[PDB]
Design a protein around this ligand. Structure first.
Ligand SMILES: O=C(O)CCC(=O)C(=O)O
Ligand SMILES: [Fe+3]
Length: 212
């Protein structure tokens, strides 16, 4: 049994998990976290299940997205679980800027961001090898699944070229795991297609100077 006492939990994000992320410099500079969230178990059930739009291109991809919008800001996040309002507040905090600066020596102060929920949930949902738009200065993908059968596909793939088989590293879409990187001319990555209808749940933070 656990002790009859308090336990420290400074924020929803464990910022030390960003500062001390696994850090690759080759094939490109990319940080990979474990245990990004201090209280991961409730996040899967609280993830939104309405308000998504299916999007696809046959660079190729098929998935669904629900953006955070100015409507959510103006109604105090009333259509979302409170944890997503807290995540928005922490991403927009000095603590997040300080953690990224320590991890990868990139200063995001004064930059803008978009934040969206990305859901792959149908057999075949995927994204093909791509680098991200050059307008994006930093991308941070965060995963929320409590369980994931690796045989179902859906891994984030770090690649050495624009080829699905030219894999250097893989990340499973499990809560606590996340990947953050600056898009560059060789930041090739993809998502291995789903082999069955299982929801694979993530949030992407896209940081930029020039709107796109
Ligand atoms: O969900 C992921 O693991 C990565 C998605 C991605 O690279 C994108 O949508 O640009
Ligand atoms: Fe991408």
């Amino acid at each position: 049994s656990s002790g009859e006492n308090l336990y420290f939990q400074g924020h929803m994000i464990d910022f030390n998990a960003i500062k001390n992320a696994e850090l690759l410099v080759k094939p490109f500079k990319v940080g990979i976290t474990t245990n990004l969230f201090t209280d991961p178990k409730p996040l899967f059930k609280s993830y939104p299940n309405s308000g998504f739009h299916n999007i696809e291109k046959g660079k190729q991809y098929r998935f669904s997205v629900r953006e955070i919008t100015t409507s959510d800001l103006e109604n105090d996040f009333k259509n979302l679980g409170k944890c997503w309002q807290i995540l928005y507040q922490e991403v927009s905090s000095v603590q997040y800027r300080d953690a990224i600066l320590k991890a990868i020596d990139l200063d995001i102060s004064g930059l803008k961001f978009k934040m969206g929920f990305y859901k792959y949930y149908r057999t075949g949902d995927w994204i093909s090898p791509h680098k991200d738009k050059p307008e994006k200065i930093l991308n941070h993908v965060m995963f929320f699944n409590e369980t994931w059968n690796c045989a179902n596909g859906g891994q984030f793939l770090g690649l050495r070229s624009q080829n699905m088989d030219d894999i250097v590293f893989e990340v499973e879409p499990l809560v606590g795991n996340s990947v953050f990187f600056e898009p560059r001319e060789n930041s090739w990555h993809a998502v291995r297609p789903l082999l069955c209808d299982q929801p694979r749940l993530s949030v992407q933070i896209e940081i930029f100077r020039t709107q796109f």
